[PDB]
Amino acid sequence: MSQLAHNLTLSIFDPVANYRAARIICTIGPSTQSVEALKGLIQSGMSVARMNFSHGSHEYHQTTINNVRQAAAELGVNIAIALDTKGPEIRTGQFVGGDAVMERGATCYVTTDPAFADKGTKDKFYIDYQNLSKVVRPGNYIYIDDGILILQVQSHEDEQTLECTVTNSHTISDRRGVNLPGCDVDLPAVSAKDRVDLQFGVEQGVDMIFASFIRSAEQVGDVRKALGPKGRDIMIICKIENHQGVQNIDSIIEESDGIMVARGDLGVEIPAEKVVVAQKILISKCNVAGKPVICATQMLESMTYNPRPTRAEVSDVANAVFNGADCVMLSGETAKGKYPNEVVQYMARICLEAQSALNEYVFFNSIKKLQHIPMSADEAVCSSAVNSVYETKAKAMVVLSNTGRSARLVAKYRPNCPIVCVTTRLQTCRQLNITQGVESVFFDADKLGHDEGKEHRVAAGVEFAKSKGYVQTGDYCVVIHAYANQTRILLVE
Amino acid sequence: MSQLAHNLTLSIFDPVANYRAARIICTIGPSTQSVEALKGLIQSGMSVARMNFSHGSHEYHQTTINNVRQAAAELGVNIAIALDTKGPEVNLPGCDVDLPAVSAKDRVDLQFGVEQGVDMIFASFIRSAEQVGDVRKALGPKGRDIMIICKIENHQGVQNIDSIIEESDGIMVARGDLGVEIPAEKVVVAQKILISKCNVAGKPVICATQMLESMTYNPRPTRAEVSDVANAVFNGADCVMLSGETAKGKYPNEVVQYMARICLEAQSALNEYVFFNSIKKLQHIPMSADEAVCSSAVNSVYETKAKAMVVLSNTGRSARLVAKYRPNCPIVCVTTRLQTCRQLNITQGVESVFFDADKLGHDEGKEHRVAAGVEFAKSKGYVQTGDYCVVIHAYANQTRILLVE
Amino acid sequence: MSQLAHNLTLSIFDPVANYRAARIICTIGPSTQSVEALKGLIQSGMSVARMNFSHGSHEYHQTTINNVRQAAAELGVNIAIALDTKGPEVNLPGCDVDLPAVSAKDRVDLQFGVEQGVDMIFASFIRSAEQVGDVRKALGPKGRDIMIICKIENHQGVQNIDSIIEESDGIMVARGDLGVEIPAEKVVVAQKILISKCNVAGKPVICATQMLESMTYNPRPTRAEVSDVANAVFNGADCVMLSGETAKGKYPNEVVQYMARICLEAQSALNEYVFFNSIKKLQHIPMSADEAVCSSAVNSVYETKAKAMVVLSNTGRSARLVAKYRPNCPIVCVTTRLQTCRQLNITQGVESVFFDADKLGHDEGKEHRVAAGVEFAKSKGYVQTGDYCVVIHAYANQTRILLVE
Amino acid sequence: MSQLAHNLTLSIFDPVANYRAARIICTIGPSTQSVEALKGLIQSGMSVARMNFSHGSHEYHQTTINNVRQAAAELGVNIAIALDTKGPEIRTGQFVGGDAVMERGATCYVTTDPAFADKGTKDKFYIDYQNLSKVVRPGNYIYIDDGILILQVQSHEDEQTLECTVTNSHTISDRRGVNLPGCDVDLPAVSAKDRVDLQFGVEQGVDMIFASFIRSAEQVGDVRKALGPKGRDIMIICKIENHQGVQNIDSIIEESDGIMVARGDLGVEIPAEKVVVAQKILISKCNVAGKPVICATQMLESMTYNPRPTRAEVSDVANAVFNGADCVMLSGETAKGKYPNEVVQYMARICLEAQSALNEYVFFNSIKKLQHIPMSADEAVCSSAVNSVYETKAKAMVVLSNTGRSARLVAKYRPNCPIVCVTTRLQTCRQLNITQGVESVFFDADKLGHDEGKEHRVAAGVEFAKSKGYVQTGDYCVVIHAYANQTRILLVE
Ligand SMILES: O=S(=O)(O)c1cc(S(=O)(=O)O)c2ccc3c(S(=O)(=O)O)cc(S(=O)(=O)O)c4ccc1c2c43
Ligand SMILES: O=S(=O)(O)c1cc(S(=O)(=O)O)c2ccc3c(S(=O)(=O)O)cc(S(=O)(=O)O)c4ccc1c2c43
Ligand SMILES: [K+]
Ligand SMILES: [K+]
Ligand SMILES: [K+]
Ligand SMILES: [K+]
Ligand SMILES: [K+]
Ligand SMILES: [K+]
Ligand SMILES: [K+]
Ligand SMILES: [K+]
Incomplete structure (x- = not known):
């Protein structure tokens, strides 16, 4: 800790x-x-x-x-x-000749008027975000082309057009992307x-x-x-x-x-x-x-x-x-x-x-201390399950999860050992690929059985952990299954 | 933490x-x-x-x-x-180099x-x-x-x-x-x-x-x-x-x-208390007075939400020993040595105020030094009237929790 | 605590x-x-x-x-x-008596x-x-x-x-x-x-x-x-x-x-959690599975505010091992032995329900025993619909947190 | 802990x-x-x-x-x-012949009427608490004579008199004290x-x-x-x-x-x-x-x-x-x-x-954990002072306190060592006799000096601890003085 x-x-x-x-x-x-x-x-x-x-x-x-x-x-x-x-994006319009040379200290005008979309120049050009006039106050900044060109809004010239100061020298071309830092963009x-x-x-x-x-x-x-x-x-x-x-x-x-x-x-x-x-x-x-x-x-x-x-x-x-x-x-x-x-x-x-330098117990302790009491069952079972890993120096976990919920919930508490998820769904095997410390084993329920006693699925996970060399005879393996509200500290044979 | x-x-x-x-x-x-x-x-x-x-x-x-x-x-x-x-001076990467x-x-x-x-x-x-x-x-x-x-x-x-x-x-x-x-x-x-x-x-x-x-x-x-x-x-x-x-x-x-x-x-993101608590928990009990004094002083900062610390230290040893425990406030070291002011520039969270003992006084009651420390902390806007300031001085073996006037 | x-x-x-x-x-x-x-x-x-x-x-x-x-x-x-x-039978009060x-x-x-x-x-x-x-x-x-x-x-x-x-x-x-x-x-x-x-x-x-x-x-x-x-x-x-x-x-x-x-x-004044936390903190890590199972089960009571526990134990060993960790709720032991029901009468916070394995079934899936335990806990008014009940069974190595129907 | x-x-x-x-x-x-x-x-x-x-x-x-x-x-x-x-007390009145034999199952009457004060019998007697009729509901209990005689109020007979059932056999005499359990007594x-x-x-x-x-x-x-x-x-x-x-x-x-x-x-x-x-x-x-x-x-x-x-x-x-x-x-x-x-x-x-079996650290830890943060200075100094005792295995404390406030405040946190209080007041020496773990030494300020540098008072306390055999050369002694907002871990010579 x-x-x-x-x-x-x-x-x-x-x-x-x-x-x-x-x-x-x-x-x-x-x-x-x-x-x-x-x-x-x-x-x-x-x-x-x-x-x-x-x-x-x-x-x-x-x-x-x-x-x-x-x-x-x-x-x-x-x-x-x-x-x-x-x-969704906010981009400039086109330009005459392709380029627009923006010199420092120069004044330019940005407009939401679609008539200037095909005929932009260095003095006046188009930005396709219609709500630009009401979103941007004077004093705010407009970034164009990966934030390289920086314009500062001086005043609202009219309903659609803003007067700007060019703060730095940079050349821009057709349909370059814009950003409104510190402005609330309301695009869908x-x-x-x-x-x-x-x-x-x-x-x-x-x-x-x-x-x-x-x-x-x-x-x-x-x-x-x-x-x-x-x-x-x-x-x-x-x-x-x-x-x-x-x-x-x-x-x-x-x-x-x-x-x-x-x-x-x-x-x-x-x-x-x-x-x-x-x-x-x-x-x-x-x-x-x-x-x-x-x-x-x-x-x-x-x-x-x-x-x-x-x-x-x-x-x-x-x-x-x-x-x-x-x-x-x-x-x-x-x-x-x-x-x-x-x-x-x-x-x-x-x-x-x-990972070899990281202290997983810090993650476990911090996250657990923040949990509101009373905990719900699913929360209690998973955190206790990970606690048991630390408590017994277990070498693997086996989580039976169909959707992935309890697999993720277990992974949250960060055990210092591999998590093996046994699941009846291939989608779940795949989607868990974005959750750390978890590896999935597919169990064909329609082929092998409903496994209501959970014996086969647990056996499938334990074998995988043995195959990867995580556990052996004498090691403890923390099994948690059906949400999932049950825990065993299993002795690996 | x-x-x-x-x-x-x-x-x-x-x-x-x-x-x-x-x-x-x-x-x-x-x-x-x-x-x-x-x-x-x-x-x-x-x-x-x-x-x-x-x-x-x-x-x-x-x-x-x-x-x-x-x-x-x-x-x-x-x-x-x-x-x-x-x-001393090619490099050897699984060999022990015994150059002078x-x-x-x-x-x-x-x-x-x-x-x-x-x-x-x-x-x-x-x-x-x-x-x-x-x-x-x-x-x-x-x-x-x-x-x-x-x-x-x-x-x-x-x-x-x-x-x-x-x-x-x-x-x-x-x-x-x-x-x-x-x-x-x-x-x-x-x-x-x-x-x-x-x-x-x-x-x-x-x-x-x-x-x-x-x-x-x-x-x-x-x-x-x-x-x-x-x-x-x-x-x-x-x-x-x-x-x-x-x-x-x-x-x-x-x-x-x-x-x-x-x-x-x-620093704005950094949790100073983690440093304080970790480093505290590794200390062998019983502690030595100076170690206990410094760790308690920083603890007193967290408990009273003191906005500054004032450490009287000629060598800078206790200034470093205080910074070790990472308070979430500035440390002000009042020192009679100019070399210490300079040497403390490699220690984090400490700022030094030079006190000229040759052309002011030895300050046995230590009042003038402490006041100089508080005034600098006021000067930098760290503390104002009503704030607490933890003063540690003489191994610096005495602690004060002071109300800023 | x-x-x-x-x-x-x-x-x-x-x-x-x-x-x-x-x-x-x-x-x-x-x-x-x-x-x-x-x-x-x-x-x-x-x-x-x-x-x-x-x-x-x-x-x-x-x-x-x-x-x-x-x-x-x-x-x-x-x-x-x-x-x-x-x-074996005057008394000697600074002498060691070696009577049979x-x-x-x-x-x-x-x-x-x-x-x-x-x-x-x-x-x-x-x-x-x-x-x-x-x-x-x-x-x-x-x-x-x-x-x-x-x-x-x-x-x-x-x-x-x-x-x-x-x-x-x-x-x-x-x-x-x-x-x-x-x-x-x-x-x-x-x-x-x-x-x-x-x-x-x-x-x-x-x-x-x-x-x-x-x-x-x-x-x-x-x-x-x-x-x-x-x-x-x-x-x-x-x-x-x-x-x-x-x-x-x-x-x-x-x-x-x-x-x-x-x-x-x-008992109404007694803080069971002090017993739980003290006795937990004295345990050597790594723990043995059965010890870890029992201590976790009681921890699960405090965390979920479960109103009852159900322990399946023939000998009463795990019934005693659970009571050791002092949950702030009743413990119900479901046992196939009548001598255990009697022997658990010297263990605090435990009540025994006899399950006749000779004239009902061995109950390998353990469903009938657990249900018998919950029904007694309902009978005594410990738990009702919506409450949590921590079930520990087989060294009893399996834990369930169950929602009472 | x-x-x-x-x-x-x-x-x-x-x-x-x-x-x-x-x-x-x-x-x-x-x-x-x-x-x-x-x-x-x-x-x-x-x-x-x-x-x-x-x-x-x-x-x-x-x-x-x-x-x-x-x-x-x-x-x-x-x-x-x-x-x-x-x-303030609630007592019965007097009785004719001195005694009143109260047999179980008997009915009696209690009245707040002062006319029955000098002439009470087993059937009707006086209780001197005027608000008895409005304080006591039917179903409530009246205890007389160290709670030996128990009467149960059946009904309000009138404005001043209550009908009662004698629930147990007991003889009472003159001016025996009464209690109203579960009733709010409003005596001055x-x-x-x-x-x-x-x-x-x-x-x-x-x-x-x-x-x-x-x-x-x-x-x-x-x-x-x-x-x-x-x-x-x-x-x-x-x-x-x-x-x-x-x-x-x-x-x-x-x-x-x-x-x-x-x-x-x-x-x-x-x-x-x-x-x-x-x-x-x-x-x-x-x-x-x-x-x-x-x-x-x-x-x-x-x-x-x-x-x-x-x-x-x-x-x-x-x-x-x-x-x-x-x-x-x-x-x-x-x-x-x-x-x-x-x-x-x-x-x-x-x-x-x-005391030899008691664990003072439990007291220190519990009380300290309950303290609201931010602590006030006096609270911070005293608790830290006691913490330093445990931290350094110190063998005595010296608290300079005039009124006794900081002496009590230190005693609260329960150090596993004697507290020596040095005080300029004899009243304080005496009043601290009801605070555990504290012993007082009187310092005549008007005779010996104002001791603004605190040197003499601290020296007086340390000597006392040496005289009682608490500390010796090499021992740590935690001194806390002026409320009191200052701490030293002193090395005893
Ligand atoms: O813009 S269109 O291309 O004409 C267009 C086509 C279809 S489609 O026919 O169903 O494929 C849309 C379906 C659902 C839409 C929803 S909603 O999630 O269904 O509520 C919301 C918005 S909104 O812009 O946020 O108001 C939609 C805007 C434009 C839509 C559609 C929107
Ligand atoms: O009852 S007496 O013997 O006539 C009698 C004599 C004096 S004395 O002349 O000052 O000695 C009292 C002094 C002060 C009193 C105060 S208070 O604390 O001063 O507010 C309150 C009540 S009270 O009963 O709670 O309302 C008093 C009741 C009866 C008092 C005195 C009371
Ligand atoms: K993007
Ligand atoms: K690691
Ligand atoms: K080099
Ligand atoms: K910070
Ligand atoms: K005997
Ligand atoms: K209790
Ligand atoms: K009394
Ligand atoms: K003791």
Whole structure:
């Protein structure tokens, strides 16, 4: 019950853990779409395949869906498939000649008038967010092109047009994206494109949605609506990208099935040092709520084209694990990168190294101390189950969970041993790929039996733990099953 | 306590702490050697000026020494001067290197440091405990008050860390040098181990090398570099170091200003009570009076929500011993020695007020010193009328909980 | 937790607990030997009938045995029968007495106990651990399931208490006998030591002699006697004993009714969580599965505010192991053995439900036994629809937190 | 931090403490009034002389006041003098022939009509509490003569007379005292006699009042008023005698300077087993509030005429200490008893024995955990001071306190070592005699100096601790002085 105290007992020469808890999400692109590249990516350490719907067509992502499924079947594994929406955007219009040279100290005008959409100049151009005039006060800032161009609003010239000062010299081109830092953007949760994309994901049976630009709890339910009745079991992981998402994180977590800390997106509007703190907050909040949380963007970026990443990047990845992250994400590194297998292998190695220094008992003790008394049964059973692991120095857990609820609930309390989930659902096997320290074994109930006495499923989990070398004769194994409200401290034969 | 539970209570839109605890060490080079550039550094947040004795001549470093003192005197502040030795010198990564502790150049350079009254030594490439004794005897009797801070550069320094910490006056964690033979992931962990051990031992720890290296020739650092600095603070670092960014860099002031900004932001998130409670719980009972006095004083801060501490300490020993227990308020050290003011610049959360015992009084009742400490705490806006201030003085064996008038 | 902090939360005008945890042992004599007088005792709160073999003949005690079984059968309950030996026999108070563990009469009386199927022995004047083995071999192989409860009567019993507790199945604290050679004030302390040690060992402890002695010939006890009983409960006694008050007394029922009243009132004040937390904190980590299971089960009671526990235990070992951790709710033991029902009458906070495995089923899935336990807990009004009930069963290695229908 | 855990480490053969913390109050009567009997009583273990103003005249108690002061001066000690008020009472009237034979099942009538005061019979008699008709409902009980005669009210016969059933056979005589269990008695805080007696106590300079029959917080201030301006420094110890006092204990403690648990008085109206619990509550509440609490009445009663007390009585005394009592009281045992020196000696021995088994750290930890944060300075300094004792295994404390406030405040947190109080006031030396674990040293400020640097007073305390053999060269001594807001861990030379 102290990371500091745990640090004192550590030695960087002692062998690393016999299991890696943290999970790796790789983005699939030109470098990784083929079956063999995926087979290499899985073997490297991929648990979840991310599809970026900012780019590519339905036919393109269809082959991704196909290839992942074939590479999963050929290696005898279950791989989660994630759909990352493009999301709603605020962009500039077009320009005459393509460019707009913005000199420092110059005055320019931004308008929501659609007549200027096709004919923008350096003096006056279009921004497609109709509510820009009522959202932005004078004194506020407009960021254009990944926050490189910074304009300051001086005054409302009319109903649609704002007078601005160019604060720094930078050239912009056609349809560059804009940000309104410190302004409340009221764009709909899902774009017209999203609605079409989300329906494709449901029709193809995606395991989860990484929902872009989530700003309030109301929006989480809008994505739910957009998924329809046939996708009620698809997880919604909400991407926090601006101050709104940070400000409303409590109610958003409550509605979401999980959170993605998108540091790159956040760092456009918020200073980088505050985003680092926002990361700490968001991860800890998710750990308390039992929901999966992903540390995403700018993870090991230099390795996209270099054989090895910078020392600071490695540090960043380890501290993601130290923060308490369920998952670490890779974007361009696996999508457009030169070292797809290599970047995943090293990230896996960094997670494992951090995990070997991490003190899980701190997580267990903190989360348990925060729980309101009286606890509900499911909460009591899972926390006690993890307590028993520490109490008896058990070497594995077996959780029987159909939906994944109690598997996640157990994982929350952070035992210092592998969790084996035995489940009657393949969707569950896949969706648990974003929860740390859990590995799933599928039990075909319609083939093998209803297993009402639970004997077979428990036996299946114990065998898996024996096969991976977690337990042996004489070891204790904490079994928790049916929610799930029952616990045994089993002696492994 | 926990960091986790504290993280839940936080908002990034809240105002940051009204004081910065972590200290900034700047390497002095061509782009920062002039008195006007040093004034820029001091105002930007430099607490310690470092001289890299791998490069340059005694005359070049004499200029550094002279200009630092001139710059500090003009701004009415006290700045530490550090001498970073060249050391003994290709690397062997599963072999134990038995090169001499200090080179012939080192023994000469170290004598130069004594003559020029440096505050501290950054002794390079320390592998064992006896090697600290070599730096000690090389500094002679005239430099026995100079702090020896050990640079951990290889596995040997890590493996023997406990004996090295005991002999030294502090530790420098040179990530880059460690990275040559030890994988980067293991260096991140070694950093935690080394920093945590130094906190328990109550000895200054410096997080050095590859801090904001991109900012040497770029106006802003990479996002990963920012996090590295913040996490250095979160680990429990007393100090953060800038090498090439201030010595040969293009933005000497901006980098120091930004490192200051990151440290303060990280500190605003940091739960000081975790440090206090952890370090308290590791203490053998029975305690020694001075240890018990200092830990109780910090406990009294948390229990009464005191907004400042005042520590009377000539040597700075009890000033360091108080900072060890990490109160969530500023510490003000009232000292009769100017070298202590400078030497405390590597200890976090402490600010020094010089009291001229030669031209005021010995202050046996200690009233004038304490009042001077409170007035500085009023001056910086830490405390106002109605606030509590925990005063610890003389091993400093007396505690007062004082109501600010 | 604390008793102190709990004391602040209390009001004497609040209703008392809906169950009595402490158990009452009654000595059977002339004024209570008849089946109608024993029915009076059982209804008044007798859990254990004691036979003093210092007086009386085998035929007299045979009547006691017969009448107790008849009385219990008519009231549909299970009552324990205890055989308190005469022992070896002036006293020496700084000298170690090496009289034989059991006398010739004892060996004969103990064989009588086996033949008549007594539940437990109160072995008199136990001084060492080997003396327990003497009682064991005297009881033979046919009485190997009979509990040996040791009477601590002199300093030797106190000095060797740790080895005696380990060998025995429980301890009797005979204040009066201790008082002969040990000052009364030191006996009060010895009582605490002995009772606390027995709680940690998870073995029954009886507070005996001079309990309500005034009530033998008076309608009410002295105020000091009342407090003595209450403080016996507060100390952590499983049982409280009546000697002459029920055997030769004038108010056999009233005294038992009053002892019951005092125990319940004391229990209403008692903080069970202090016992749970203290006894938990003394456990060596790693734990054994059965120990961890039982302690977790009680922890689950406190965390979910379960109103009852159901323990499946043939021998009663896990029933005792659960009661060891002192939940603030009733424990219900479902057992296939009638001797266990009787033997659990010296363990606090446990009530037994007999399950006839010969004329119902073995119940491998254990469903019928658990349901029988819940139904009794419903019957006594401990739990209703919506309440939680912690079920521990098979070393009993499986825990369930069940919602009552 | 567990009495249970502490019990495990105990051995009844290990030598007892080097100091007795608990304080003994002896009642002075026919057996103890003379100087030599008091000199024997002090040497036996008396700290406070109790004067019972239920009996005796002003001239009688005057000699007590005198003799105590002479016996104190002759032994070089400071002895506290306590005035115990008679209090307001509800009594029956007189009877014809002196007796009234009350047979079970009989009907009788109680009236508040003053015409029946001098001529009572078995059928109808007087009770002097005018508000009896409005206070007592039918179904309630009237206790007469130490609760031996029990009447049950059947009905209101008229405005002044109640019909009653005699529930048990018992003969009563003239002016026997009555109790109304479960009824709210609204008699004034102080009787006419009390007002005269309290003024005598102020004029003679008594250290404290044991105020009888305290039922509410308002009443505590009435005694204060009755003491006048010249007695504002006289402690008010409130005697809790019925359910009202128990029900209102929180506000009564807040106003009082301390509490007396009068078990005998309480046990008249409340079942004995509930009074035992009431004792636990009241003592613990006082310990938290920092006020002295006395366990009184029926302490070692059989020793009034027997050479040795019953085993249960010894047990009762020890458990008084275990409960957390500051003081243990003696009534008839020292007043009218045959063994005045003997009863005090044994009580002292029992307290010391209990103290040797008691775990003070439990008291320290519990009380400290309950303190609201932020603490005030005085609270912080004293608790830290006691913490330092445990932290450094110090062997004595020195508290510089003029009024006694910080001495009491330190004593509250229960260090496992003697507290030495250095004070500029003799009244303070005396009044601290009811606070456990504290011994006072008088420092004549007008004679020796104002000691603004505190050096002399601290030196005086340390010497006393050395003289009593508490500390020696090498030992740590925790000094706390000026309220008092300063602490030193001093190395004893
Ligand atoms: O914008 S359109 O492309 O015409 C368009 C088409 C369809 S579709 O026909 O069902 O596919 C929509 C279905 C459901 C919508 C919901 S809701 O979740 O169902 O309540 C809310 C909004 S709103 O913008 O937030 O008010 C919608 C806006 C626009 C929609 C749809 C919305
Ligand atoms: O009852 S008497 O003997 O005539 C009598 C004589 C005096 S004395 O002249 O001052 O000595 C009283 C002084 C002060 C009194 C106060 S108070 O504390 O001053 O407010 C209250 C009440 S009360 O009964 O509660 O209303 C008093 C009742 C009776 C009093 C006195 C009372
Ligand atoms: K985006
Ligand atoms: K670990
Ligand atoms: K080097
Ligand atoms: K902070
Ligand atoms: K005997
Ligand atoms: K209770
Ligand atoms: K009275
Ligand atoms: K003690």
